[PDB]
Structure formats: C-alpha cells, structure tokens
mmCIF file of N, CA, C and O in Angstrom:
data_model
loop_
_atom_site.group_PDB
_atom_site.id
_atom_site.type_symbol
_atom_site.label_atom_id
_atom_site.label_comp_id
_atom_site.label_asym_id
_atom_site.label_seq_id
_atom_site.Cartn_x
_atom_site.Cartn_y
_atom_site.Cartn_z
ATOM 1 N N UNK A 16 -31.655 -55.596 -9.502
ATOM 2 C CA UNK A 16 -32.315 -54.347 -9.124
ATOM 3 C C UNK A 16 -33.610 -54.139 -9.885
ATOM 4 O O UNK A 16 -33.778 -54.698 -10.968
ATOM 5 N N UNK A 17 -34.747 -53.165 -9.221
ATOM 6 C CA UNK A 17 -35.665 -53.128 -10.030
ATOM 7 C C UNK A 17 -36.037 -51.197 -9.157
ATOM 8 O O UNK A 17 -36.217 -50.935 -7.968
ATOM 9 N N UNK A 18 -36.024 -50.384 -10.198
ATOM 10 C CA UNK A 18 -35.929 -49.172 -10.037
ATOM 11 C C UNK A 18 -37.577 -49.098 -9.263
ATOM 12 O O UNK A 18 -38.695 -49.538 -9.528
ATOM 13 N N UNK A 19 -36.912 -48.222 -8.115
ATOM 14 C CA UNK A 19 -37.416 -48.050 -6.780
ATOM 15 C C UNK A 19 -39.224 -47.852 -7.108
ATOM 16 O O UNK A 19 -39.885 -47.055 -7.774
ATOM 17 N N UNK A 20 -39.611 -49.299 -6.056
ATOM 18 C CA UNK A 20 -41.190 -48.961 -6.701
ATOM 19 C C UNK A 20 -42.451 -49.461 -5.409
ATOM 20 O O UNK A 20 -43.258 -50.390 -5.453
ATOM 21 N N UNK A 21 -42.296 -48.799 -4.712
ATOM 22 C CA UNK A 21 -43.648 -48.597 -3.626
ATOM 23 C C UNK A 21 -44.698 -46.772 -4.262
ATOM 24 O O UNK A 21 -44.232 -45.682 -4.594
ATOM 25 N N UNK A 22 -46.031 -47.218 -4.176
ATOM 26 C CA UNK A 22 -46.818 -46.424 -4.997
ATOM 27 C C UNK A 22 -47.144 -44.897 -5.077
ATOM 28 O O UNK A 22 -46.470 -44.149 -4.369
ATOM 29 N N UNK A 23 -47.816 -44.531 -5.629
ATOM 30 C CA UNK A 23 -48.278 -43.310 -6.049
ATOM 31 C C UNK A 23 -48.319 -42.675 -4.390
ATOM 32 O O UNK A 23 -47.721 -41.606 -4.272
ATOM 33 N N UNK A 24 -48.855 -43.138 -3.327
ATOM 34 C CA UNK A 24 -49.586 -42.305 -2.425
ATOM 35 C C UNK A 24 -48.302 -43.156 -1.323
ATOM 36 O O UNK A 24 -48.397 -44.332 -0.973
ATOM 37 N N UNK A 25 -47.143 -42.198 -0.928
ATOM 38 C CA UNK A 25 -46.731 -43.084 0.343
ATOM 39 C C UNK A 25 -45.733 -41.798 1.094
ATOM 40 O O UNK A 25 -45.328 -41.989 2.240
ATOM 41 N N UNK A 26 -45.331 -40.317 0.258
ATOM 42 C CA UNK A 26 -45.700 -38.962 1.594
ATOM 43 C C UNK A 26 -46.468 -38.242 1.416
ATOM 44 O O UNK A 26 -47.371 -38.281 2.252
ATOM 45 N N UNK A 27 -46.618 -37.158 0.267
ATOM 46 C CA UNK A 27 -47.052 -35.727 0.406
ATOM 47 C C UNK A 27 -47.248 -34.943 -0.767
ATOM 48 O O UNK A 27 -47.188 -33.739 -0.518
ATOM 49 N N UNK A 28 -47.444 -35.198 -1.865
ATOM 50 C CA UNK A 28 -47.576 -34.264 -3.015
ATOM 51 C C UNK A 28 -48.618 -33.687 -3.732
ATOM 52 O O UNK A 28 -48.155 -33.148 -4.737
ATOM 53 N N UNK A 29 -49.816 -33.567 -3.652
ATOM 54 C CA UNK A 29 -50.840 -33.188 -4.732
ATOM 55 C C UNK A 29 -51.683 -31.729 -3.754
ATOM 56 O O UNK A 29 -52.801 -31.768 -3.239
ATOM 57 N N UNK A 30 -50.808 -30.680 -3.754
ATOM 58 C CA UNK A 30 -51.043 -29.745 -3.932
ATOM 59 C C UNK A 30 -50.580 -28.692 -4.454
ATOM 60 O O UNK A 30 -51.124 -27.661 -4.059
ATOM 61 N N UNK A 31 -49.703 -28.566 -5.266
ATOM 62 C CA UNK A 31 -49.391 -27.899 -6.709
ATOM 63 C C UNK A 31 -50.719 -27.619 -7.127
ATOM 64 O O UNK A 31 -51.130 -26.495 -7.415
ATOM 65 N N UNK A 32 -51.399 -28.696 -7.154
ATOM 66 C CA UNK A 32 -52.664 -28.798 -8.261
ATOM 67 C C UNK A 32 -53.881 -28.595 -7.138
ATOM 68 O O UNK A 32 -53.616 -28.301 -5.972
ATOM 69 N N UNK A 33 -55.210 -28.780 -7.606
ATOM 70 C CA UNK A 33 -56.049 -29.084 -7.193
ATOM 71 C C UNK A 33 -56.560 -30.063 -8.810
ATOM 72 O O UNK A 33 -55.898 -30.353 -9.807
ATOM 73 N N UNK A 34 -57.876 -30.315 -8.470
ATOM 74 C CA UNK A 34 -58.130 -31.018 -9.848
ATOM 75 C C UNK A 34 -59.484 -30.373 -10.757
ATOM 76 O O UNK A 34 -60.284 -29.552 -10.308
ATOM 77 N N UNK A 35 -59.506 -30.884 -11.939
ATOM 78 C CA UNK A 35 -60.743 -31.482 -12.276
ATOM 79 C C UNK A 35 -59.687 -32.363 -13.820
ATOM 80 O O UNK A 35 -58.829 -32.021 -14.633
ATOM 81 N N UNK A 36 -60.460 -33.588 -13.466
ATOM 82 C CA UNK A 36 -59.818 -34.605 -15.134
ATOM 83 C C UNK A 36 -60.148 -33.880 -15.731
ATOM 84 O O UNK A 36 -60.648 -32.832 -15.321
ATOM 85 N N UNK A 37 -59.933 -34.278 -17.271
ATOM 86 C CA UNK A 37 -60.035 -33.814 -18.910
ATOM 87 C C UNK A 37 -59.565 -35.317 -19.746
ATOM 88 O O UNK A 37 -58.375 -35.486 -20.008
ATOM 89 N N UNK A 38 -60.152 -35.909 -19.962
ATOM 90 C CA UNK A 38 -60.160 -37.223 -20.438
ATOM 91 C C UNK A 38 -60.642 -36.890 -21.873
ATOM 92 O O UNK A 38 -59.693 -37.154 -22.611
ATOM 93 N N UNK A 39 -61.570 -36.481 -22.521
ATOM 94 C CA UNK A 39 -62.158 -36.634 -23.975
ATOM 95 C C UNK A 39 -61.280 -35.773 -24.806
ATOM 96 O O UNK A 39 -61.729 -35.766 -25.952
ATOM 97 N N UNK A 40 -60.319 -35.116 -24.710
ATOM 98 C CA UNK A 40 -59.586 -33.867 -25.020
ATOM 99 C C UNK A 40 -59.915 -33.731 -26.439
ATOM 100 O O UNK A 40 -60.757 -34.428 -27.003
ATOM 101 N N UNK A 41 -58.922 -32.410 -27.241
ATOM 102 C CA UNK A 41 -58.972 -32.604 -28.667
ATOM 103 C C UNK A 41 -59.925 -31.210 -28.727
ATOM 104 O O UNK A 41 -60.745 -31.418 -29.621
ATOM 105 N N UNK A 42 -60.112 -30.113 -28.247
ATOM 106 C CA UNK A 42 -60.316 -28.849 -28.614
ATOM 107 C C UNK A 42 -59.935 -27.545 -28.787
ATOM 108 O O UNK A 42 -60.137 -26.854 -29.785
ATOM 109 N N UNK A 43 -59.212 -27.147 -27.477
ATOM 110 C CA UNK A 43 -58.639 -26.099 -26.874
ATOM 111 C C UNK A 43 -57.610 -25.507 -27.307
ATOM 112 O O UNK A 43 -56.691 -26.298 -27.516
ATOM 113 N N UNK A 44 -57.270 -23.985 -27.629
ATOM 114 C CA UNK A 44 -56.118 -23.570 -27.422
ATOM 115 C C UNK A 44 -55.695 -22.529 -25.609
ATOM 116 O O UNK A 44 -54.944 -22.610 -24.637
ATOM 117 N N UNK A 45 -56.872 -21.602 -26.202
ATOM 118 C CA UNK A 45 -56.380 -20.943 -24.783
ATOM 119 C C UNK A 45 -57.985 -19.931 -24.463
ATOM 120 O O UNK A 45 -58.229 -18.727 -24.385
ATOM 121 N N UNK A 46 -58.966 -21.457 -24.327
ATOM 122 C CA UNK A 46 -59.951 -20.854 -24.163
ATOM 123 C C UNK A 46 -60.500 -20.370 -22.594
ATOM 124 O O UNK A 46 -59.913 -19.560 -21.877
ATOM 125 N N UNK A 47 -61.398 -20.873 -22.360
ATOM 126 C CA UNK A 47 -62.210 -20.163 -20.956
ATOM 127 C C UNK A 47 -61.734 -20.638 -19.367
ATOM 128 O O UNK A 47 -61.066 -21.637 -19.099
ATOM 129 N N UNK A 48 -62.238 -19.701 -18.467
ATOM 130 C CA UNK A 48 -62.526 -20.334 -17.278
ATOM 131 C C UNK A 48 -62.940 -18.485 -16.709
ATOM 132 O O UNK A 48 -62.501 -17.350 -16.893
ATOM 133 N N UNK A 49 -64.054 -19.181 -15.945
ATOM 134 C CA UNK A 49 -64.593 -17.731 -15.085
ATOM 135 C C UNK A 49 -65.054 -17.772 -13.406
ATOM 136 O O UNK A 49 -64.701 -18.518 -12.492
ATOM 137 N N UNK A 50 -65.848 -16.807 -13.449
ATOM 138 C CA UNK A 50 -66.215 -16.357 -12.570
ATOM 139 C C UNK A 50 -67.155 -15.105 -12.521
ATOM 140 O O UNK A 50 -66.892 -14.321 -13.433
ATOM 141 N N UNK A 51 -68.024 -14.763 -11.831
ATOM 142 C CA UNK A 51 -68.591 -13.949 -11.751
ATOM 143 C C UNK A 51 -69.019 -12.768 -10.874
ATOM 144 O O UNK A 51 -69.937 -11.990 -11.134
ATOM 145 N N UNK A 52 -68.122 -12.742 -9.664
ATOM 146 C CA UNK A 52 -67.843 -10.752 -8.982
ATOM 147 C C UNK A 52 -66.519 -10.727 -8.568
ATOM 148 O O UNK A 52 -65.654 -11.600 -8.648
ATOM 149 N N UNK A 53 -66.476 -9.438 -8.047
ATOM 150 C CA UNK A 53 -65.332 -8.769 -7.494
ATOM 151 C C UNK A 53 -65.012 -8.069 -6.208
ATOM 152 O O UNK A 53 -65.473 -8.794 -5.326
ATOM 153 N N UNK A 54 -64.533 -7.169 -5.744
ATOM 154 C CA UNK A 54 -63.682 -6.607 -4.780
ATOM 155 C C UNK A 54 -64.218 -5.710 -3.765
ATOM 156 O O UNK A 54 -64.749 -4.810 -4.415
ATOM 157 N N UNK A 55 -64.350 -5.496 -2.679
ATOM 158 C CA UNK A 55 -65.214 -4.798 -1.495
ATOM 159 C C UNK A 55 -64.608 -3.275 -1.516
ATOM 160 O O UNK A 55 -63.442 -2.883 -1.490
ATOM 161 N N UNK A 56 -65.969 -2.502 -1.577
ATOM 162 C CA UNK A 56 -66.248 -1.113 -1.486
ATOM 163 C C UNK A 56 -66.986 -0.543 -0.184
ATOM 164 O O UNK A 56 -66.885 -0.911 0.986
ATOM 165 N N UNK A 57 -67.898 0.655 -0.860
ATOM 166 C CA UNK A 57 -68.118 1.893 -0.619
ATOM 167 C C UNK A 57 -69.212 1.911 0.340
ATOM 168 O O UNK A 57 -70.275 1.587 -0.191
ATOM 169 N N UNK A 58 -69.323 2.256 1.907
ATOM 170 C CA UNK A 58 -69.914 3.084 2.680
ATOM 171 C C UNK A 58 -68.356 3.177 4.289
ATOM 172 O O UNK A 58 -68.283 2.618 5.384
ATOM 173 N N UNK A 59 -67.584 4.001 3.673
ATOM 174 C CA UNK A 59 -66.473 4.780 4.147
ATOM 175 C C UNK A 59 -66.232 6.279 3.073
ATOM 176 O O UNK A 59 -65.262 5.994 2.371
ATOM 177 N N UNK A 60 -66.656 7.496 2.753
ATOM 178 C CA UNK A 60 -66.591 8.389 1.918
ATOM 179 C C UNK A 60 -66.613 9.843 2.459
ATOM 180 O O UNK A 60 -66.107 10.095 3.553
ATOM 181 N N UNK A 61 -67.513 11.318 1.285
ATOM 182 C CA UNK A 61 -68.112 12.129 2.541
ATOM 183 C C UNK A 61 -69.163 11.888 2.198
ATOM 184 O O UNK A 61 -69.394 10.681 2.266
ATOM 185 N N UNK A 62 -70.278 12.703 1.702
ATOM 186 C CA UNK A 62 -70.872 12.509 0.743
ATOM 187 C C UNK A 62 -69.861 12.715 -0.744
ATOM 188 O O UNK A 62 -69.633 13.613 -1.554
ATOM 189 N N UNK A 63 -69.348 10.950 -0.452
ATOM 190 C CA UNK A 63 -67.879 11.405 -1.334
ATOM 191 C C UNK A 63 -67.994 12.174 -2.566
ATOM 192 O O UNK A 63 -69.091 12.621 -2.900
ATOM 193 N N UNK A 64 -66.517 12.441 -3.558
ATOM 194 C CA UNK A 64 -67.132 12.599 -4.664
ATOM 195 C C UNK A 64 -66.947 11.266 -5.339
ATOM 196 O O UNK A 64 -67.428 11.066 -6.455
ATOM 197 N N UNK B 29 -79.453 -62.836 -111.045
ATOM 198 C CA UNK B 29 -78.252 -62.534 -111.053
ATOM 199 C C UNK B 29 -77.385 -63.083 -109.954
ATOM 200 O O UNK B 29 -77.372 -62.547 -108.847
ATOM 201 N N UNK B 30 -76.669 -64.129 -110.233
ATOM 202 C CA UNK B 30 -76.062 -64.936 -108.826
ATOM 203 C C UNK B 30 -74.608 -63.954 -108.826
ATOM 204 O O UNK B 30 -73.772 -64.166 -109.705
ATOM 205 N N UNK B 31 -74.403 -63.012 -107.919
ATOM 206 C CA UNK B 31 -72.872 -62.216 -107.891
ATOM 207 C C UNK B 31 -73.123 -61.919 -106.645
ATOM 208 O O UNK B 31 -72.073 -61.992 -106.007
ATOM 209 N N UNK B 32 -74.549 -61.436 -105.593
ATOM 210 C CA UNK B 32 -74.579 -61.483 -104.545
ATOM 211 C C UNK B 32 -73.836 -62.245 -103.146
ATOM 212 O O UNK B 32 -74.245 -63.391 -102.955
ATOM 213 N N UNK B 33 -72.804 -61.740 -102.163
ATOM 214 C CA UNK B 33 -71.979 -62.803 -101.114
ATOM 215 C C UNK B 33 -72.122 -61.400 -99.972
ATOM 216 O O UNK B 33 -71.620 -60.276 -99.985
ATOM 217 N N UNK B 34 -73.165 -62.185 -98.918
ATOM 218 C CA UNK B 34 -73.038 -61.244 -97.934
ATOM 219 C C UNK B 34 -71.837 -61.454 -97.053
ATOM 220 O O UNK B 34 -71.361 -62.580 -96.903
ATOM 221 N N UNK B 35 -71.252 -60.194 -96.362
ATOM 222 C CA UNK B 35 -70.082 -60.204 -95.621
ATOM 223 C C UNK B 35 -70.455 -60.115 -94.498
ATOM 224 O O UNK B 35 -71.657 -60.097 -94.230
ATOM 225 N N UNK B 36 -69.522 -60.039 -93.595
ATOM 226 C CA UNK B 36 -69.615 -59.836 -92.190
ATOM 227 C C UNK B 36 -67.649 -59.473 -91.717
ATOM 228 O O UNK B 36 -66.534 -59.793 -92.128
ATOM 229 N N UNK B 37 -68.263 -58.639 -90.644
ATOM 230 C CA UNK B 37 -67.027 -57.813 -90.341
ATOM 231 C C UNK B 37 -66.763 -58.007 -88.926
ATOM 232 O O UNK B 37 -67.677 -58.399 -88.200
ATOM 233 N N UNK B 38 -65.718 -57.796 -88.506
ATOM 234 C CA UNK B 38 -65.267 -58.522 -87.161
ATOM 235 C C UNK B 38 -64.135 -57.521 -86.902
ATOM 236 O O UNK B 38 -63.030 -57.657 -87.427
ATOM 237 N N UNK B 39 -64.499 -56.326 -85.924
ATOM 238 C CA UNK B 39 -63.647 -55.603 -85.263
ATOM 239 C C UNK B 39 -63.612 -56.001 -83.714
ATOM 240 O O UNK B 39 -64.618 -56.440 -83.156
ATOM 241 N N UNK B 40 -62.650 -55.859 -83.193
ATOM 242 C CA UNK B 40 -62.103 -55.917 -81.792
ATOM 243 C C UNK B 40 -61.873 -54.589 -81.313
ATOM 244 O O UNK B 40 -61.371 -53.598 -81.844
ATOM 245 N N UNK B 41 -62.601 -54.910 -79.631
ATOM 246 C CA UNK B 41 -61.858 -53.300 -78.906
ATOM 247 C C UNK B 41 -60.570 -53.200 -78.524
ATOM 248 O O UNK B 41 -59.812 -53.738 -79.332
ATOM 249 N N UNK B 42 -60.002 -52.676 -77.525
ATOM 250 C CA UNK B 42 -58.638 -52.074 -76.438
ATOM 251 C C UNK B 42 -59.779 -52.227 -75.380
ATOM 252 O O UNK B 42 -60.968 -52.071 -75.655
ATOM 253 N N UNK B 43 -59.438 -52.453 -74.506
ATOM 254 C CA UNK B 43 -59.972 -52.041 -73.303
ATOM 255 C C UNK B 43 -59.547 -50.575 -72.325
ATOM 256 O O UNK B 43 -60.307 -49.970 -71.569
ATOM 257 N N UNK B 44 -58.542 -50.357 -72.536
ATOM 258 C CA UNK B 44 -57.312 -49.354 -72.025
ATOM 259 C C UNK B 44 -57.529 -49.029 -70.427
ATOM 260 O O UNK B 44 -58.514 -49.406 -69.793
ATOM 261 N N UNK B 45 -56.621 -48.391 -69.977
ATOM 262 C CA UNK B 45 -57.052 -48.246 -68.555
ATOM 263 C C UNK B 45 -56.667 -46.672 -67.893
ATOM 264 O O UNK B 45 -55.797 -45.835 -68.135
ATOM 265 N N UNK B 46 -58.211 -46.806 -66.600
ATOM 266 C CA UNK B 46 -57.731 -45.013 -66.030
ATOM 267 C C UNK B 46 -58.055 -45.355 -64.539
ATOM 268 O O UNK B 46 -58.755 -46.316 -64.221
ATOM 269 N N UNK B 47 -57.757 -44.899 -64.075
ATOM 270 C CA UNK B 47 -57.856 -44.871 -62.502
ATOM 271 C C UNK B 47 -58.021 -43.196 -62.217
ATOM 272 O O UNK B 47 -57.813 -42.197 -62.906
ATOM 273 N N UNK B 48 -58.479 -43.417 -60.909
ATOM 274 C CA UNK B 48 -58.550 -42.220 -59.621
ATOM 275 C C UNK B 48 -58.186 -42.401 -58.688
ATOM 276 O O UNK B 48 -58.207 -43.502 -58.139
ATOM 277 N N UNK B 49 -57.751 -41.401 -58.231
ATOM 278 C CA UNK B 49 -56.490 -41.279 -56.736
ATOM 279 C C UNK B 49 -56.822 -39.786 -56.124
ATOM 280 O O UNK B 49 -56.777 -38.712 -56.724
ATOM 281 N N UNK B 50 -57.219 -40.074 -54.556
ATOM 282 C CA UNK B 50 -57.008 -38.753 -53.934
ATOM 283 C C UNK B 50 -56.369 -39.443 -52.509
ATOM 284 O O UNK B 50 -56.175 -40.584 -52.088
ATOM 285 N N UNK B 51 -56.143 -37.910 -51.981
ATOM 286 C CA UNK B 51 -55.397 -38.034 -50.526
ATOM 287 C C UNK B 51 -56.391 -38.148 -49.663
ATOM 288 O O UNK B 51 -57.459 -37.965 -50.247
ATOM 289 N N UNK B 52 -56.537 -38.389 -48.417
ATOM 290 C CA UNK B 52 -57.245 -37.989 -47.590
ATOM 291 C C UNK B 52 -56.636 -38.268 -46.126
ATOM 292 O O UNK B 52 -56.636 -39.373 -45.584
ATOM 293 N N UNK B 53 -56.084 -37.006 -45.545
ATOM 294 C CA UNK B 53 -55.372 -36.933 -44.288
ATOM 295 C C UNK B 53 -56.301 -36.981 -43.474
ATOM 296 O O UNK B 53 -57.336 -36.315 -43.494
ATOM 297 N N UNK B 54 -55.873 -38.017 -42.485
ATOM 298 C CA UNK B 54 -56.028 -38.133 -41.054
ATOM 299 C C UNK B 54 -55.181 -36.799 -40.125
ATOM 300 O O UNK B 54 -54.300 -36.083 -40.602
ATOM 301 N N UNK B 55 -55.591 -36.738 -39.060
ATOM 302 C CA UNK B 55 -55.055 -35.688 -37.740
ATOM 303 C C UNK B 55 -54.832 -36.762 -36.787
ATOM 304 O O UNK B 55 -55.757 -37.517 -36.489
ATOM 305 N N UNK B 56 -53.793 -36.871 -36.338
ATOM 306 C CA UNK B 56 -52.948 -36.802 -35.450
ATOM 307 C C UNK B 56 -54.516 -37.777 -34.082
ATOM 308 O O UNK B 56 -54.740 -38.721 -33.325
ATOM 309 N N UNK B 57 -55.102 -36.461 -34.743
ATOM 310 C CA UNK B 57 -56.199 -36.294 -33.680
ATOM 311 C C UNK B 57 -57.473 -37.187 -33.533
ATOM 312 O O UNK B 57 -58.018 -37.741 -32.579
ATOM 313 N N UNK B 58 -57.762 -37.084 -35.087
ATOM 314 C CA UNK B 58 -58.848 -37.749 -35.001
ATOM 315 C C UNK B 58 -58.575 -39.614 -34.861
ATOM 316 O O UNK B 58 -59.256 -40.407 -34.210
ATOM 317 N N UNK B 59 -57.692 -39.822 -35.478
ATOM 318 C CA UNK B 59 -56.955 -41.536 -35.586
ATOM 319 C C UNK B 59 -56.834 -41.587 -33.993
ATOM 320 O O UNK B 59 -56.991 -42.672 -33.434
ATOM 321 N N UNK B 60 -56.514 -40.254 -33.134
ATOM 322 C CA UNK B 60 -56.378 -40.724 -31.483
ATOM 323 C C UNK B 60 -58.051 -40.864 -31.405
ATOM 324 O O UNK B 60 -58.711 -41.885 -31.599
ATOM 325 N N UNK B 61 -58.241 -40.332 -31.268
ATOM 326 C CA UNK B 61 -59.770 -40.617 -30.971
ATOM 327 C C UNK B 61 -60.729 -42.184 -31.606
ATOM 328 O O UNK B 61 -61.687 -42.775 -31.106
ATOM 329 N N UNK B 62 -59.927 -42.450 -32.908
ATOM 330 C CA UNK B 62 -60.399 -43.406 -33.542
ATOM 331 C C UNK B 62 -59.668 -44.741 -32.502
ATOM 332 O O UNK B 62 -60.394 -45.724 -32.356
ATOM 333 N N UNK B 63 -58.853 -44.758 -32.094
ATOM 334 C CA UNK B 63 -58.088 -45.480 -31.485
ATOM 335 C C UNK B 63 -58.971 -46.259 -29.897
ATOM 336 O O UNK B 63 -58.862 -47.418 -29.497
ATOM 337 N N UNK B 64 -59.485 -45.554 -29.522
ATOM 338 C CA UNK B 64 -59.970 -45.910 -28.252
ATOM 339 C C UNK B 64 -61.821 -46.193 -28.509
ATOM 340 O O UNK B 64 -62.637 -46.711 -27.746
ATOM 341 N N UNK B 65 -61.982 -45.664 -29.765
ATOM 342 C CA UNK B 65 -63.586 -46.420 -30.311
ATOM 343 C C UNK B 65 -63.914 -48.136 -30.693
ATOM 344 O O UNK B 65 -64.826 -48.928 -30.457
ATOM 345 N N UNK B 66 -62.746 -48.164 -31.336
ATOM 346 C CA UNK B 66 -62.428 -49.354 -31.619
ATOM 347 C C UNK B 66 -62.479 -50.502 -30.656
ATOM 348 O O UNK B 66 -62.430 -51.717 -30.848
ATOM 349 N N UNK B 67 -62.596 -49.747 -29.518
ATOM 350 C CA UNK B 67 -62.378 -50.849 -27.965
ATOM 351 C C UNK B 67 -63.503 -50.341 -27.588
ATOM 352 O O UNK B 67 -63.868 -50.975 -26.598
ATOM 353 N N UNK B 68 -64.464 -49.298 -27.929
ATOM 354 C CA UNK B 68 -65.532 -49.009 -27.107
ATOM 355 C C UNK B 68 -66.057 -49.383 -26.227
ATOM 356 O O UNK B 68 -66.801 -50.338 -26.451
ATOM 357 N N UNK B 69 -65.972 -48.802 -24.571
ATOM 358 C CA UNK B 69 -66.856 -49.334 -23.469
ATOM 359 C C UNK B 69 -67.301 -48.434 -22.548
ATOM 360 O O UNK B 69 -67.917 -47.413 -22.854
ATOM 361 N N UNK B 70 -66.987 -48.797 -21.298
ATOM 362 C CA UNK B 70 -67.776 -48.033 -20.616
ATOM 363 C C UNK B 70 -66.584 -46.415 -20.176
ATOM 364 O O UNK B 70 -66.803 -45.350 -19.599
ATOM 365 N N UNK B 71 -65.991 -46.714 -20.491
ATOM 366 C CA UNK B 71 -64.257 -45.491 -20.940
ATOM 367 C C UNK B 71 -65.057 -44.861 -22.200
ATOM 368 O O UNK B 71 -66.175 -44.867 -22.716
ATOM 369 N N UNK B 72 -63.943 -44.393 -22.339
ATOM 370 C CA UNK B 72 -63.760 -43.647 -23.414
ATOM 371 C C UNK B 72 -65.532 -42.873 -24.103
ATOM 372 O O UNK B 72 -66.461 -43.397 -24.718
ATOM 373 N N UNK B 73 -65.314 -41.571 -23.636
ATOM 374 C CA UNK B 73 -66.200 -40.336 -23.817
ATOM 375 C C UNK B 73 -66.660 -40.572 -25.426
ATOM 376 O O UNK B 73 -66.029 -40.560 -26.482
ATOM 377 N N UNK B 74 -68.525 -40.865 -24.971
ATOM 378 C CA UNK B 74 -69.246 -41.130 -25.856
ATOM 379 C C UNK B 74 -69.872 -40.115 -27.039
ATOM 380 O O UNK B 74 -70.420 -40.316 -28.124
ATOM 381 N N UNK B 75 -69.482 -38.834 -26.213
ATOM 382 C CA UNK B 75 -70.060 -37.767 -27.310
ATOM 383 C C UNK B 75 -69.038 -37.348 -27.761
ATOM 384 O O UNK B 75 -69.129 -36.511 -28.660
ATOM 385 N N UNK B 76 -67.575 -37.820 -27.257
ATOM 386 C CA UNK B 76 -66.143 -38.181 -27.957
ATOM 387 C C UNK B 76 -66.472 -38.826 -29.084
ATOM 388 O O UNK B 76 -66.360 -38.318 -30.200
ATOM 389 N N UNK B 77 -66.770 -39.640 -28.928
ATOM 390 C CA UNK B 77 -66.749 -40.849 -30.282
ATOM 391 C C UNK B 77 -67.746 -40.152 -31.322
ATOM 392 O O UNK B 77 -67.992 -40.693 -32.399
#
C-alpha cells in the first residue's frame, strides 16, 4: 500500500480562503489590514433633523 | 682592592590563566531566517536576509 496519492487539484476546495502568500514572515502579532469608506445614506429625510 | 664579584639574578614568571565567556542567544527566528541564506537564490526574500 502507499497512502492514497493523486494531487493537490483533482475536486473542489480553495474557497475557504482567497489568497495573498506571506513567504518572508517573522513580524506580526495582530497588526493591520484596511480599507477606506463606508455605508449608503442621506437624500430620503424632511428637511430632516 | 680585589673583593669586588658581580652577580646576576635569575627570576622566573607563572604565566597563570583567565578567560571570558558570554551568552549570546539566537531566536528561534532569526537561525530560521539564517537557514535559507545560507542557500541563497533566487527564493528566499532578499530584504529578508
């Protein structure tokens, strides 16, 4: 026997994730990731307050 | 006046002995990093090294 071995890619799995590598590692605890706007508003009101 | 006999004197040193000793720890981290310089090529992240 030789424990079951046809490759990486043969149904369906890599979307859990999306990606980007990290290869040089060796900094981080629980630093960044952003973005920059937010959430849809205002011309529904009276001349609200 | 013949009573004049110049001498000469003959001392020996010790040499004795001292040494110095310090620690100096490696991380885990940096020896990983040292690890894949050592093979340096077109791998392993250069502003890593």
């Amino acid at each position: 026997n030789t424990l079951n071995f046809v490759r990486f890619l043969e149904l369906g799995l890599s979307v859990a994730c999306i990606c980007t590598k990290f290869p040089e590692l060796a900094y981080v605890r629980d630093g960044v990731i952003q973005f920059e706007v937010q959430q849809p508003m205002i011309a529904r009101d009276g001349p609200h307050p | 006046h013949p009573v004049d006999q110049p001498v000469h004197n003959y001392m020996v040193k010790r040499i004795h002995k001292r040494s110095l000793s310090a620690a100096f720890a490696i991380a885990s981290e940096a020896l990983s990093l040292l690890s894949n310089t050592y093979v340096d090529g077109t791998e392993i992240d250069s502003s890593l090294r």
